[PDB]
Structure 1
């Protein structure tokens, strides 16, 4: 039974950004809709990346063949050491070829994994579940890894925050809202943590309430009346 001015704000915010460059093949969400973490939001055309993957896998296959063939000649030569039929320089040379082929195998495995992860990142996702806004990018757009502007922003809409203020002069714990000049939000909130924010110049106490928002009806950035029991 004491009401204060309040602002709603998001519990979690994440920007949707590409980790790989290319062309946006498709947008998978409606703007302003509820989204789940890890779901494909945009598909970057994966054709060229799929290829780099198939290529790198083919360099691996050649390299493993080359390594296997050289490994077999090391074994042949090893069992002929000490006999009329081979020399230590010959074996040492076969050893060198093997090592050389093995290094190639090494580097090729690296190339495959690199190109595998680029392929996977062609489906662009959000780290959190929430309400996605407008898309800042049209379909068929050129996106670059590391570009300034985010493609979209998602805001976690369930547990919602409400920042509340009282003056120095003003001075289990229920909080509730009058949504917009009358009607009351049918959810009850509590204070999030045993902590405050105090203003330096003017003596002031800002509190934070946390409300469940399962019907996804509260939005952040809303001016709201808040009362505390």
Structure 2
């Protein structure tokens, strides 16, 4: 219990502590996939970036470059997905606790 009982507190200043142990890794689980999310997507990024240089050049095969650029498009979307996963977790981790957005006598 972080606060001083009966004192007055600002908003969102977290004076209690849940055990993060469960969630704390839980946040990490998303933080893991996000990396996995960015990872697989990052490589896609490089893939298109390379191919893009191919653009106008021979092998590009506008379809295929598009295939990766999708993968770019596709992967990064997953990137956005995991980022929230991290986000949902974080807001579920640093969620704890303080406090009633109101800032007042506790």
Q: Is TM more than 0.5 here?
A: yes
Aligned length: 105
Cα distance in 2, alignment partners of residues 51 and 65 from structure 1 = 20
| Cα distance change on mapping 1:33 and 1:103 into 2, 3 Å | closer
Cα distance in 1, alignment partners of residues 67 and 103 from structure 2 = 59
Structure-2-length-normalised TM-score? 0.74
How far did 1:127 drift?
4.6
| Cα distance change on mapping 1:39 and 1:79 into 2, 3 Å | closer
1:108 aligns with 2:82: yes
Structure-1-length-normalised TM-score? 0.38
Give unpaired runs (5+ residues) of structure 1: 1-26, 132-229
Aligned counterpart for 2:15 among listed residues 35, 41, 45 = 41
RMSD: 2.8
| Cα distance change on mapping 1:125 and 1:86 into 2, 3 Å | closer
How far did 1:69 drift?
0.8
Q: Deviations over 1:42-61 (max 9, x none)?
A: 32221111111111112111
How far did 1:124 drift?
3.9
Bigger fraction of residues in helix: 2
How far did 1:85 drift?
2.6
Query: What does 1:44-193 align with in structure 2 at a 5 Å threshold?
Result: 44-128=18-102
Cα distance in 1, alignment partners of residues 3 and 55 from structure 2 = 68
Is contact 1:41-1:126 (8 Å) kept? no
Higher normalized contact order (CA 8 Å, seq sep 6+, divided by chain length):
2
Give unpaired runs (5+ residues) of structure 2: none
| Cα distance change on mapping 1:121 and 1:79 into 2, 3 Å | closer
Cα distance in 1, alignment partners of residues 44 and 97 from structure 2 = 40
Bigger fraction of residues in strand: 1
Q: Which has the larger radius of gyration?
A: 1
Q: Deviations over 1:142-162 (max 9, x none)?
A: xxxxxxxxxxxxxxxxxxxxx
How far did 1:33 drift?
7.0
| Cα distance change on mapping 1:95 and 1:42 into 2, 3 Å | same
* Residue aligned with 1:34, SS: coil
How far did 1:70 drift?
0.8
